[PDB]
Ligand binder design. Structure first.
Ligand SMILES: O=C(NC1CCCC1)[C@@H]1CCCCOc2cccc(c2)C[C@H](N2CCCC2=O)C(=O)N[C@@H](CCN2CCOCC2)C(=O)N1
Ligand SMILES: O=C(NC1CCCC1)[C@@H]1CCCCOc2cccc(c2)C[C@H](N2CCCC2=O)C(=O)N[C@@H](CCN2CCOCC2)C(=O)N1
Ligand SMILES: O=C(NC1CCCC1)[C@@H]1CCCCOc2cccc(c2)C[C@H](N2CCCC2=O)C(=O)N[C@@H](CCN2CCOCC2)C(=O)N1
Lengths: 215, 211, 256, 195, 246, 210, 221, 246
């Protein structure tokens, strides 16, 4: 006979977020993999939702694309119906309900919402596949998350250090994001090729790239 | 997860930890496990994070509509019945929800436990989550309805601490809210259990504590 | 469909200086049985778009029907050449069909390649479309098409979709793709593109049991979609060690 | 389920268990005696699990330790006894396992009062306090909260009473009959407690 | 895999494809499925590669033991005093491959040392000990074998050792492997008793070619072994493509 | 898989200049979420130049440690010398493989000094194993246990070549603590042993107890 | 894993990547996959790491024993027989896919051995998760009678194909050339993968930043 | 089951065995696997009997609907005015059965009513609606069909509707059923373009005979339908035994 087809596949990759006082960094590698082969070395995981809000996801690429496009559609409809752009918090709740609407046949997507609210606070929300979400100062989804989250805990919170550091700034935070993603690339077979680093601050959204290892 | 609540002579104490887990990996240590249902009703979250969050927010919406329509405050019993019916409708679907609803209404202070299987149990003292047996043992050992606010808060904190000490699923921060006739107060917004261990079990801090 | 029964193996599509070159052997197998040896696996969608498939033949024929009628309706509403659907449009449509079927657990058991020319500025073919006549089979020359104006998309069973300068399906995702990632380059001539595709197909013939050496090449260029004459690929073994008789080796031990 | 509790202090060790013998849905006895295995030389093995496995493993351990002590005309050290027990359980784990949980207690001049906690997989560690069974979930936090070094025997018995009241009140099986073994001052005493 | 044996007037011919695959992947393009057991005794392997290889190694050892035990004491034959060659090069000629690789050994021929067949094990004996080995472990072993050889008693012979460890002697032809099902009726229709060397060679080659054409599990090149009373000839054919007028 | 989650725990090895460090969590879990002990060391001294860290199933940890102690003691009494760390590492590999099909559910590391006798030079030596004895010789760090991914991230990010004993202690302790803070079934204390040719420093860290 | 070998003029050349994985995590970034069997026989291993380590060690030591007892140059055929018989005995549960190469009285030989016990004498082959990519390159570019430098370049290109196209492969490229008179193990031969981004200054924790509960110093000798 | 179709110079011939079996038991000795859809359109059935029967019944209904919708209004062809016999009796002669049953109708021939092919559905249309029906329910339906027929546009045609609901047009021959695997290469070797009626008849008969010889699932008798532009001929052959010189 024929076995029942499984509707899920992990296409790999990592998304990393880090808030500041007035900025948020969201970075993601661009590899797209299938089992132990590479579909393509350039498949961006971050989509722009608003001038002040982006979304980055890891998991099944078809699900991520559909969910990003659905969220963009819903947000444009919201703008037309209500005359204003939704804040990051509104989008966070909307994404929660969208994910939970499939509670019993979930999207295979782990999503980080990054943006700056009206008060110019850097904001991060990170999600599970069924809609659970929480606000955080740094987060990471995808194959490399269990490698990266300890590093950012150590650097940002410093809970286990008596002599602490309190000099945080955008350049150092970006350097930390780059080191975290490179260290993850060192050990996670599904993270590599190239990373896009998005920075949101007062002016708006800015994009830069960093090369990762190819093996 | 460890959540608990109990009645005492000045109202209801509600205490929770703040850890969220994905398998054995700690997803967060700052989640908020006490959800304001309305001005006078608090809900605690145990079990699935999405299920608890969604259905307690849905209950909040239902109660808002009810209290607009009828120009009166819903009772804790009615809120718990609504939630239990909604959850029972999803029986067999695999919802994971352990919820304690506490509040004040015209019938006084009330407390109900509601789980995904449709269970709805009125009571004066509850605990849910992986760490709930430890909280239960501590509370039952040291529970008196005539405790003052300070004693009640201290007992809730100690129970949460012991639960997080013995249960790998519980930890992070302890939050202790107080529900009274005119709403609720956050007595302890969030206190790392790290300090609690070296305050209760090993104040000397000169060698590793031995269970 | 519950699983593959009659299957085609692998397709290769690459951009070169005059458009798209897509290739597939003309074989459909019933398990390990090579029942059909003259099967068309690359279909014309419109004058600028082609569809290649691997996997189940019945699902591929279904999808080809869908796209044929989609192009027909497109032509029914056309008022100017710009209105014709691009390869990107068809790739989006196919990715959507696959996503919807995944959500029902009712997928088409195919991997699909949608390739073509994503511009209308290189010719006037879509000004008077002929569905049932071909004029290419006059003495004009190909126009070089900027790579950015060319499109090669991929869709798999789960709805995974992406575009690239070269796309492979099936065993070409290992054998052909390795050589392409090593050796493909922009603005290749038809000769160089054909040579590289033929090297990939030769490796596939030597290493893929489902493959054959009867190759159909299709080109999408300023002249439209052209089906080349099918041809047998000459594949000779690359070592005399294979042909050495076994009796000339030592009779003792595991000599085989 | 068989609830086992152990508490060691500077000057004592106390073990306690429910006294129920269970056959499916009925209590064969309210005064079970197949859990405690007193061993010559201020040692005690306390076992939970199936009665048959309990009897087999416990009597095997007791007989082998008595044999050792008769052959070498000396008392086995408590730590040696604990690791011999663990090793035998681990030998049978991959061949024909004894599904039994153990608390091992004793006194000797070399190490004072010792308590070892061992589970049915033969995972063992020395502990100051420990419990086995489903009632462990309900007594462990009480043990943690009320234990301190320099605890007296009477204080430890009061802690055990707290544990028994919690088991009676909150545990699904309302256990109200208990037996305790108290080791201190070079003597082993037996007590029975009803809550 | 396709393995064939055909008895003709003056010998027995064994042919095979050379493809070994694991699924749809071809792990070995040109394996060697026709293996010498003794100077006049060959076996064609089918089934799982590890199984047939280890079985054949064991059988070769057994055959050495039997042969050396068959040696009689003394001297013998103090007086006893003991065909049109296949144009292999023309079979293997292709227009697009002419001197493209000049160095290519496609043929070999050798003569029997045991000229009178004084000690060479009987084909039947080796085949039956193989059947015994396969049958004793037929709960695990999955491989089908064709034995071909020449002995002074029964002359040229074919023995099919089938899956599960049964043995059948064939007096015309034997076929095995997933590819032979396709050429079953072709061979049945084209075979006749007392064929010449040339007819047998052409027939066995065409059988393998058709099987490779129709079976994905078969392919590569073709190895043909011809076993006569005095010599063994081996050929490799690399012109395997099939041309249909239609 | 879940067998390793039954108890939890992890071990970490790191080398500096003429020094090497081995660290472990102190928890003994049961049923993956119940903490039954907070002094269950995974670090064992074979001889002055050879330590082993054993994470995994506690019964198998104790059993394997006893086997290794037996073998090392016999070897050293027969030879009248301390066992070289590489001989011990190969022996551990062979012992684990001897159970190839019913293995000990252990995730060992070996940390110590390779002595190059001219005067004597002390070269740090580190090796990580799987449960059937595959070996990974390294110069910077080794990890094992259910916390392996977090330790790998922390080490890849923070390890610094050629640190002195104090720098080595701070680095390995920070790596271990950060990794443990993200694990539900590991922690409840950390022991850190910093080795030099002259002395061993044993420290217990003021770590999280939840 | 990507291992490969080919036959060239009076020499056998083996090549391997150096990644070992434990699930999706890279466990060893510089593991050795080329194994010395004898001065004239090497082998490359793919599959279960422990099985490969112990099978190749057993083979090496038995081969040395045989050489001492017979005082003759070891044969590649002997390694094939011994290895295949062992692997067959374990019915593929010893997951050892091995490319065995060497030079002896019968000239340069190369064998592809599979975990179930089959073997095949070949001019070239690749094994492991990356074997399809390496085989693409080798099929494209292999030739009879290559020089040793050409063979080394081709082996390196094949291993690199595996390294860059298969997630289970990575690290450096190791090569060994085995002739009649000696071998040459080059490790690393390529080194195509290194860390790209480094932080501008390595984090050095100030002394005393980590809180401690107890500390004891114990001197040695 | 063996079903075959072969295109020859002046028509298309369809042949089949007649055995239907339930395991090793033959439930129907002589089924009828070649069924008339329209006067010039036949289908050869393979696979599960219930599936192919109910599919063909549905298709016959659809074909009646199509045909009557194809009828144009008015009158046409107010002026338009529109081979070696098969010695079936000698094919069917057996020494041991001579007048043993005199009453035996082994042949039938009829002429098309729609002489100009004014309204008969195209072979391709009927084949494709069948493919549609099979594909829509290919999770449950297991049956492979061969369509043969003649229309004024494409002349004699063969369409293979394969399992899972794919359709391929064949321009030389089509084979299906468990028995055809055995005659694959025999037919490939013996087929040529533009065969005569006599050559095609002999070839298709021999193909079925060989398949019945080799396949236990095939047997019974042989039914041959010949479809030309003007008439349809049907034959039954009962001399199916195969005689080998060897
Ligand atoms: O801690 C938790 N409960 C406490 C924290 C708040 C309330 C109390 C639970 C503990 C286990 C819950 C078991 O019931 C489930 C019900 C539905 C789904 C899933 C589990 C699987 C889902 N999985 C597994 C991997 C992929 C995925 O989606 C998953 O475990 N989700 C995490 C959410 C953790 N965070 C997500 C974002 O940030 C806030 C919390 C989650 O529900 N944990
Ligand atoms: O004292 C012993 N021999 C006396 C008894 C008869 C006469 C002498 C030896 C001690 C030798 C020490 C060497 O280190 C090991 C070498 C090999 C294996 C193992 C350890 C681990 C193995 N383990 C560990 C737990 C599960 C398991 O299988 C295990 O301990 N085997 C026991 C045999 C135990 N049975 C023997 C007869 O008595 C009843 C029990 C064993 O080897 N003992
Ligand atoms: O790369 C690898 N082979 C190449 C690397 C060099 C030679 C070739 C394989 C690639 C995947 C194979 C996994 O199939 C197994 C089947 C049975 C047993 C085990 C593994 C054992 C074990 N398992 C199984 C899951 C739990 C566990 O632990 C495990 O995965 N071993 C890892 C290496 C382990 N580490 C040892 C020391 O550090 C380096 C790596 C391993 O063999 N990987």
């Amino acid at each position: 006979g024929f076995k029942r087809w499984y509707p899920y596949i992990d296409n790999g990759g990592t998304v990393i977020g880090l808030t500041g006082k007035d900025y948020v960094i969201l970075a993601a590698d661009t590899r797209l993999s299938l089992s132990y082969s590479i579909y393509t070395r350039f498949c961006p995981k971050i989509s722009k939702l608003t001038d002040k809000c982006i979304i980055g996801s890891s998991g099944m690429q078809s699900d991520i694309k559909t969910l990003h496009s659905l969220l963009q559609k819903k947000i444009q409809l919201f703008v037309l119906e209500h005359s204003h752009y939704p804040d990051i918090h509104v989008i966070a709740r909307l994404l929660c309900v969208i994910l939970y609407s499939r509670r019993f046949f979930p999207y295979y997507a782990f999503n980080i919402l990054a943006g700056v609210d009206e008060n110019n606070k850097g904001v991060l929300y990170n999600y599970d596949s069924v809609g659970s979400y929480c606000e955080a100062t740094h987060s990471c989804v995808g194959s490399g998350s269990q490698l990266i989250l300890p590093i950012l805990d150590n650097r940002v919170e410093q809970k286990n250090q008596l002599i602490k550091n309190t000099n945080f700034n955008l350049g150092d935070d970006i350097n930390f994001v780059k080191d975290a993603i490179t260290s993850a690339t060192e050990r996670d077979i599904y993270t590599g090729d190239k990373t896009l680093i998005y920075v949101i601050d007062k002016m708006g959204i800015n994009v830069n790239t960093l090369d990762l290892k190819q093996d | 997860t460890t959540t608990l609540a109990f009645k005492f002579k000045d109202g209801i104490i509600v205490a929770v930890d703040s850890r969220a887990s994905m398998g054995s990996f700690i997803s967060s240590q700052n989640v908020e496990k006490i959800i304001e249902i309305n001005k006078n009703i608090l809900g605690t979250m145990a079990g699935g994070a999405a299920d608890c969050l969604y259905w307690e927010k849905y209950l909040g919406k239902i109660i808002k509509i009810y209290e607009l329509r009828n120009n009166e405050k819903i009772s804790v019993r009615a809120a718990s019945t609504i939630l239990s019916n909604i959850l029972y409708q999803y029986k067999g679907y695999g919802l994971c929800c352990g919820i304690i609803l506490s509040g004040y209404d015209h019938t006084g202070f009330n407390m109900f436990y509601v789980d995904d299987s449709g269970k709805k149990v009125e009571g004066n003292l509850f605990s849910c989550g992986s760490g709930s047996t430890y909280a239960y043992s501590i509370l039952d050992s040291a529970y008196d309805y005539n405790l003052n606010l300070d004693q009640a808060v201290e007992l809730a904190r100690n129970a949460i601490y012991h639960a997080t000490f013995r249960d790998g699923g519980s930890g992070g921060k302890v939050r202790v809210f107080h529900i009274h006739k005119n709403g609720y107060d956050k007595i302890i917004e969030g206190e790392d259990v790290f300090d609690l261990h070296y305050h209760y079990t090993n104040p000397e801090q000169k060698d590793q504590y031995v269970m | 469909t519950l699983g593959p029964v009659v299957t085609g193996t692998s397709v290769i599509a690459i951009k070169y200086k005059h458009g798209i070159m897509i290739a597939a052997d003309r074989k459909a197998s019933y398990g390990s049985y090579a029942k059909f040896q003259n099967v068309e696996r690359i279909f014309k969608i419109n004058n600028k778009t082609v569809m290649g498939f691997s996997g189940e033949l019945a699902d591929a024929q279904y999808l080809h029907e869908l796209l044929t009628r989609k192009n027909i309706n497109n032509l029914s509403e056309k008022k100017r050449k710009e209105d014709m659907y691009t390869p990107q449009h068809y790739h989006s449509y196919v990715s959507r069909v696959f996503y919807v079927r995944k959500n029902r657990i009712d997928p088409l058991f195919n991997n699909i390649i949608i390739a073509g020319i994503n511009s209308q500025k290189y010719d006037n073919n879509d000004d008077n479309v002929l569905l049932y006549t071909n004029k290419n089979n006059n003495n004009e020359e190909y126009k070089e098409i900027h790579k950015d104006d060319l499109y090669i998309g991929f869709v798999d069973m789960h709805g995974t979709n992406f575009c690239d300068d070269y796309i492979t399906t099936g065993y070409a995702r290992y054998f052909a793709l390795t050589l392409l990632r090593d050796h493909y380059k922009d603005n290749m001539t038809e000769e160089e593109a054909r040579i590289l595709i033929n090297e990939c197909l030769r490796i596939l013939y030597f290493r893929d049991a489902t493959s054959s050496n009867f190759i159909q090449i299709v080109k999408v260029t300023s002249k439209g979609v052209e089906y080349e004459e099918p041809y047998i690929l000459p594949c000779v073994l690359n070592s005399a060690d294979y042909v050495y008789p076994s009796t000339l080796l030592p009779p003792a031990g595991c000599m085989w | 389920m068989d609830t086992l509790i152990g508490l060691r202090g500077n000057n004592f060790v106390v073990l306690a268990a429910d006294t129920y013998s269970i056959n499916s849905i009925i209590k064969l006895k309210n005064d079970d005696n197949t859990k405690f295995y007193d061993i010559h030389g201020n040692k005690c093995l306390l076992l939970g699990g199936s009665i048959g496995d309990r009897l087999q493993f416990g009597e095997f351990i007791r007989k082998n330790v008595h044999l050792y002590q008769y052959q070498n005309n000396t008392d086995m050290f408590v730590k040696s006894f604990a690791f011999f027990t663990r090793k035998n359980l681990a030998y049978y784990l991959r061949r024909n396992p004894f599904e039994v949980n153990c608390l091992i207690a004793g006194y000797d001049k070399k190490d004072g009062y010792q308590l070892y906690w061992c589970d049915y997989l033969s995972n063992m560690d020395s502990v100051n306090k420990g419990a086995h069974g489903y009632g462990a979930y309900l007594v462990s936090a009480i043990l943690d909260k009320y234990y301190h070094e320099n605890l007296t025997v009477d204080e430890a018995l009061d802690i055990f009473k707290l544990c028994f009241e919690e088991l009676k009140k909150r545990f699904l099986l309302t256990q109200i009959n208990y037996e305790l073994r108290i080791m201190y001052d070079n003597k082993v005493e037996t007590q029975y407690v009803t809550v | 895999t396709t393995i064939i044996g055909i008895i003709y007037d003056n010998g027995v011919m064994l042919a095979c494809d050379s493809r070994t695959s694991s699924g749809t992947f071809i792990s070995n393009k040109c394996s060697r499925k026709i293996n010498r057991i003794n100077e006049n005794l060959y076996v064609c392997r089918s089934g799982a590669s590890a199984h047939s290889q280890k079985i054949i190694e064991i059988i070769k050892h057994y055959c050495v033991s039997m042969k050396n035990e068959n040696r009689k004491k003394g001297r013998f034959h103090e007086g006893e005093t003991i065909d049109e060659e296949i144009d292999i090069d023309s079979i293997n000629y292709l227009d697009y491959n002419n001197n493209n690789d000049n160095n290519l050994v496609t043929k070999n021929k050798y003569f029997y040392e045991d000229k009178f067949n004084d000690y060479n094990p009987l084909v039947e004996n080796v085949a039956h000990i193989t059947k015994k080995i396969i049958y004793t472990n037929n709960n695990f072993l999955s491989c089908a074998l064709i034995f071909g050889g020449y002995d002074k008693i029964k002359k040229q012979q074919l023995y099919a050792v089938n899956l599960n460890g049964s043995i059948i002697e064939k007096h015309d032809f034997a076929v095995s492997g997933s590819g032979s099902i396709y050429i079953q009726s072709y061979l049945q229709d084209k075979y006749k008793k007392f064929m010449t060397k040339k007819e047998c060679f052409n027939l066995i080659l065409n059988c393998v070619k058709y099987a490779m054409h129709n079976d994905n599990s078969s392919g590569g090149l073709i190895r043909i072994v011809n076993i006569t009373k005095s010599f063994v000839e081996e050929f490799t054919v690399v012109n395997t493509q099939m041309n249909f007028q239609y | 898989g879940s067998i390793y989650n039954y108890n939890g725990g992890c071990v970490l090895g790191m080398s500096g200049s003429n020094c090497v460090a081995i660290a472990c969590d102190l928890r003994l879990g049961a049923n993956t979420f119940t903490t039954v002990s907070t002094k269950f060391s995974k670090i064992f001294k074979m001889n002055n130049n050879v330590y082993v860290g054993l994470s995994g199933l506690a019964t198998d940890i104790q059993t394997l440690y006893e086997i290794l102690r037996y073998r090392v003691n016999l070897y050293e009494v027969r030879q009248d010398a301390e066992m070289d760390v590489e001989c011990f590492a190969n022996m551990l590999s062979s012992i684990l493989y001897s159970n190839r099909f019913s293995p000990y559910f252990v995730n060992p590391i070996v940390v110590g000094f390779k002595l190059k006798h001219y005067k004597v030079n002390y070269e740090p030596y580190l090796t990580a194993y799987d449960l059937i004895g595959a070996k990974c010789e390294t110069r910077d760090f080794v990890v094992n246990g259910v916390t392996s991914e977090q330790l790998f991230g922390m080490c890849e990010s923070l390890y610094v070549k050629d640190q002195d004993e104090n720098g080595l202690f701070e680095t390995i302790s920070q790596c271990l603590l950060s990794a443990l803070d993200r694990d539900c079934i590991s922690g409840w204390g950390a022991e850190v042993l910093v080795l030099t040719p002259e002395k061993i420093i044993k420290k217990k860290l003021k770590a999280r107890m939840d | 894993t990507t291992i490969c070998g080919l036959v060239c003029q009076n020499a056998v050349i083996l090549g391997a990547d150096t990644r070992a994985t434990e699930g999706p995590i890279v466990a060893d970034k510089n593991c050795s996959k080329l194994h010395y069997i004898s001065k004239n026989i090497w082998c490359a291993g793919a599959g279960v790491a422990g099985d490969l380590e112990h099978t190749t060690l057993w083979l090496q030591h038995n081969v040395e024993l045989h050489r001492l007892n017979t005082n003759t140059q070891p044969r590649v055929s002997m390694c094939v027989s011994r290895l295949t018989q062992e692997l067959f005995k374990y019915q593929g549960y010893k997951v050892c896919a091995i490319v065995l190469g060497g030079v002896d009285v019968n000239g340069p030989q190369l064998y592809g051995i599979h975990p179930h016990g089959s073997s095949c004498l070949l001019p070239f082959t690749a094994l492991g998760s990356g074997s399809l990519n390496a085989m693409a390159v080798l099929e494209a570019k292999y030739r009879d009678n290559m020089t040793i430098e050409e063979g080394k370049n081709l082996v390196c290109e094949a291993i690199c194909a595996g390294i860059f196209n298969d997630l289970g492969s990575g690290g450096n490229v190791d090569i060994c050339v085995i002739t009649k008179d000696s071998y040459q193990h080059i490790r690393p031969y390529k080194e195509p993968n290194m860390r790209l981004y480094h932080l501008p200054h390595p984090t050095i924790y100030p002394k005393g930043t980590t809180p401690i509960l107890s500390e004891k110093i114990e001197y040695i000798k």
